[PDB]
Amino acid sequence: TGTSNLVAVEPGAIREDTPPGSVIQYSDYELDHSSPFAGGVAWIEGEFLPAEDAKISIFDTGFGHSDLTYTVAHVWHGNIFRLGDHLDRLLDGARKLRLDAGYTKDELADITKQCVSMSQLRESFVNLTVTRGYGLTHQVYIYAIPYLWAFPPAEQIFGTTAIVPRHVRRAGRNTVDPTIKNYQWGDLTAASFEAKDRGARTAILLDSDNCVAEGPGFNVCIVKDGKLASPSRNALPGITRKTVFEIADQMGIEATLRDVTSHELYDADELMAVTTAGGVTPINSLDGEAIGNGAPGPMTVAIRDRFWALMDEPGPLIEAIEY
Template sequence: MTTGFERGAAFVDGRFVPVDEARVPITDVGFSRSDVTYDVVGVWDGAFFRLDDHLARFERSCAGLRLRLPFSRAETTEILMRLVRLSGLRESYVDVICTRGVPRDGSRDPRTFENRFYAYAIPYVWILRPEDAETGMDAVIAATVRRIPASSVDPTVKNFHWGDLTKGLYEAYDRGARYPILLDHDGYVTEGSGYNVFAMVGGELLTPEAGALEGITRRTVLELAAEEGIRARSAAISEQAFRGATELFATSTAGGVMPITSLDGEPVGAGLPGQVTSLLRERYWQAHKDPRYLTPVDYGPAPAH
């Protein structure tokens, strides 16, 4: 029996609806001005992975943009649980969004707006599919665009200011690749379009300390590396150091640990996933069975929507 929620479920204006029926007001400045923040948490094998960490970051992002969430942490959790339960998805990409909202009587004063909350659950999204992991990511260091300065748009607050990242994507496609990595205006590595990056440099695993989102997958990798006795830390990474790395990989909720096997058309190391990359990728997916990180979904009868 079909329920209408097989392609996903959304929470809009206090109602649960099939994701294909979800609508955002065209006058919401989250849409018209990108005045919005969001977070994405994965559901894997019927359980949320690091749900509280994602919601804590979401709350910090809202506070950083002076947005007011209409729901408590517990209420938000129940909304997300219900979305996954309605969809029946065992592997899901679950998004929470808070926008500035709709102006009142044409006001441009953000203090007068009623902030809006949206959420949805759809099938799991992959930046790099598991069957492509051995082939890996073909990355380029973008030459035509630099990352938006952190003093203008704080990269630790998840946002939709993707003008620079989208330009980087087009450059990658034009150069026969798919995955751009952007430098900042001082020439240091920041991040890619929806993923953090790591580099093995001088026997140490490094990830950019500035100009990038403080990803939950990134945090997990740093924790797992410490458990494995791998020296790992955040640091400023020059373009030269990045190009000389013996291993490179990217991290994201939408794919976990993803090997980068070529950079600007040249192989990274042997052109295959490296030893450290492979170990951390295996440990990352093993962590999805670790109760420390999991919030199981109750798939009992979904309540009426």
């Protein structure tokens, strides 16, 4: 059909079932639908709008040339996670693209948190996008929408399945650069359709030298002999990946950003996907072969459970939204 295994990025429900007793639980509340904003807020051209109405000029160069960068932060239990790190990454990427947001980091942070508050969402998927714009003025778009899962909560707890594409590789840093977060998903979409065709949930892509690159919307972490590794070259420098490495260091696990060869990927003791929209996902099998026992690995479970706990512990990583 015309539908990939990738989650559609648009406003969706406010809550979704999660495994009972699991580390993942939504907040208990309601939206006051007296506000037109409740459920999703978009900030386009300095004006807030109900997400249902959020529109951009068809002539924005961010559309016709995909000339932009973006970042996504999540809100969990009313707390925004690592917003400052996301703003730093977004602004650094815009600089590399010679894009000027026209707003300082603090102005962006205030605008973003305001979007969440007006949305009334305690769990949210928050996107900041900076584009080349149109007649020339660069454009900043921000939206806070209900939470989105790259992998459903059930797969976060019980694991997902992956293949390595036979026909696709991840674009290299000298072509469409994966190290700047971008909307150019041609390879990622093709890999997802190949995974769907083969009966797997997703794909882990290789780069041109057959090193692990990343997946469609996530970094990949590889566990071997009690050590954790993740690709250093053709992969986004993910914030979830950064969090996972901090969690591991605190657990006394050695975590290294390095080239991971295709041999190492297939020989892994554990595999996991890491991304802001849903966190740490175990990958139970690769190309239909069990990784470990074919169920979530022990280090993955430990790190994933610690990751959700971070969302509730006061500290530098989290800030409470004011509703």
